[PDB]
Structure 1
C-alpha cells in the first residue's frame, strides 16, 4: 500500500525560479519520488513519498526550513480525492462501501464511521487514488440515485470537508467570566438565551424531518 494520498505533502512559500529538479532534490534523502505537481505562479507544490513514515520524517525535517532565502511551509495534503458518504444503512460494512464505489475508480480506503460504542453513524469515507475518480463518483451520485442496500435510501455524496486543525489561527479586554450586575452581564445573558433558541430551532428541524423521513421508511418497509 505505497504512494497513497496519506503520503502526499504540500510545500508552500516556494521561490518563483523553482524547477521540478530542485523540488525533487529537496526530498532526495527520503526515497524515490512519486507524482510531483508545482503551481509556480502561486508558489506551492505537492509530492507523494513511498510511505507515511517517510512523509512523517520529510515533513518534520523540512517544514520551516529556508530555500533561496524563503521559509518553506511543509504539511500533509491527504484529502484531495476523499468523499464523505451519508445515509448508509447499519448493514453497510467497510467492504460493501469499498465494493459499491470501486466502479468509479481505484480505491485506497473506504471506511464506515462508527461511534464510541462501535455503532454505525450512517456516515462513511471513500478515498480514491485520483481526483477525477472522486469527481466522477460525486457527479454520478448527485445526478443519479445510488442505492447500497435493499432499502431504497439514496447515498448522499459530498467532497470530504477538511478543516485546518494543524496550523490554526496564530498572531482589548482579557479573558474573564461576566460579572453579575455589570453591563457585559446583561448582554452575555442575552447571548446565552439566543444560543438556546438556535439549539431549539435546529433540534426541531432535525426532528420534523426525521419524522417525515421515517414516515417514508414506513412506506418503504410496507412495500417489501
Structure 2
C-alpha cells in the first residue's frame, strides 16, 4: 500500500542493510532485495513502510538529496512502487461491453495465415517490437559500461586523494623537523658566542688584576723614596 522501489543498490546491499538504511525516514514494515534464482542481487529493492507520509519523506528526501548506503558513493535511486494486481486481474464480469468490447468479441482467438493483411501486418509489428527490445538492451549495456568506467575513475581518484593527503602530511613533518633542527642550530650558536665571550671577560679580568697589582706595587715603591 505504502511502498517504494529502490534501484541502484550494490551487490553487497542486504535486506538487513535496507531495513536499517530506510528506518532514517520512518518505520519499515518490510524491506527486501530483489534477487535472481541463483541467489545473486538484481540491483533493485522494495521498502514497504507502515504509512504513506513515512514513504513520502523517504521519496522526497532521496530525490532532493544524495542517499548513500555503503562506503562506495553509489546514490540509491528511490522511486514510488508501481502497484500492479495479479491476484484478481481483469474478470469477464467487470469487463464492460461497450461498442468496443462487443465488437472485439466478434472474432475468436485465432492464428492469422499468410497473405491476409492481418498476418502481414502482424509480423511487421513484431519486427518493430524486436527493434525496441534490441534498442532497450543497448541503452542498458552502454550505461552499465559507462558506470563501470566511472567506478574505474572513482577508483584512481580516491587513491590520488589519499596519496596526496599523506604526501602533504609528510611534508609538514619534514618542515617541522627542518624548523626544530634550525632553531637548535641558532640556540647552540648563541651558546657558542656566549662561552667565547664569558671566556674573554675572564681572560681580561685576570690580565686587569695582574696589571693593577704592578700599579699598586709601583705606588708603594714610589712612596718609600
| TM > 0.5 | yes
Classify the TM-score, shorter chain: 0.5 to 0.7
Q: How does 1:43-58 map to 2 (within 5 A)?
A: none
Structure 2 segments unaligned to the other structure (5+ residues)? 93-105, 159-225
Answer whether contact 1:83 1:125 (CA < 8 A) is retained: yes
Per-residue deviation, residues 100-154 of structure 1 (Å, max 9, x unmatched) = 1111111111111111111111111111122111111111111000011111110
Q: For the residues of structure 1 that align with 2:142 and 2:73, how far apart are their CA atoms?
A: 21
Match of 1:187 among 113, 118, 121: 121
Determine the C-alpha separation between the residues in 2 that align with 1:169 and 1:199.
26
Structure 1 consecutive aligned stretches of length 4 or more whose deviation exceeds 4 Å: none
**Greater helix proportion:** 2
**What residue is the counterpart of 1:114 in the other structure?**
35
Count of matched residue pairs = 145
- Structure 2 distance, partners of 1:203, 1:92, is 25
What CA distance in whole angstroms lies between the structure 2 residues aligned with 1:218 and 1:143?
A: 27
State whether structure 2 residue 132 is matched by structure 1 residue 198.
Answer: yes
Instruction: Identify, as 1 or 2, the structure richer in strand.
Output: 1
Q: Which has the larger radius of gyration?
A: 2
Deviating more after overlay: 112-121 vs 179-188: 179-188
CA contact (8 A) 1:84 1:157 kept: yes
Render the CA deviation track for 1:70-94: whole Å, top value 9, x for unaligned.
Answer: xxxxxxxxxx221111101111111
On the 8 A contact 1:151/1:220 being kept in 2, the answer is: no
Which residue of structure 2 lines up, in the alignment, with residue 178 of structure 1?
112
Q: Distance in 2 between matches of 1:110 and 1:223?
A: 33
